[PDB]
Amino acid sequence: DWFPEEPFEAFKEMRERKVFDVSDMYTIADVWGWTWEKDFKNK
Amino acid sequence: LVTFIYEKVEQVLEVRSIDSISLNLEKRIKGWNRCIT
């Protein structure tokens, strides 16, 4: 058994094996509601 | 008079645990370190 060499297929395996999924991809600006930080970081 | 050349394990535990990236996995860890970032 191996995860695919291609990163995108490896992400598809990450979903299918539920080792990592988008619901775990969260950070404070998305969690404590710091909606203002969008306006600061990228400028 | 003539020389031919003719064609004719627990040690794995000592190296599958001490580790030195000895397998096909490396071909993939390298590629991921090259792309995923």
UniProtKB/TrEMBL annotation, chain B:
UniProt subcellular location: Plastid, Chloroplast
Superkingdom of origin organism: Eukaryota
Self-association state and partner proteins as the record states: In plastids the minimal PEP RNA polymerase catalytic core is composed of four subunits: alpha, beta, beta', and beta''. When a (nuclear-encoded) sigma factor is associated with the core the holoenzyme is formed, which can initiate transcription.
Family label: Belongs to the RNA polymerase beta' chain family. RpoC2 subfamily.
Known role: DNA-dependent RNA polymerase catalyzes the transcription of DNA into RNA using the four ribonucleoside triphosphates as substrates.
Protein name: DNA-directed RNA polymerase subunit beta''
Phylogenetic lineage: Eukaryota, Viridiplantae, Streptophyta, Embryophyta, Tracheophyta
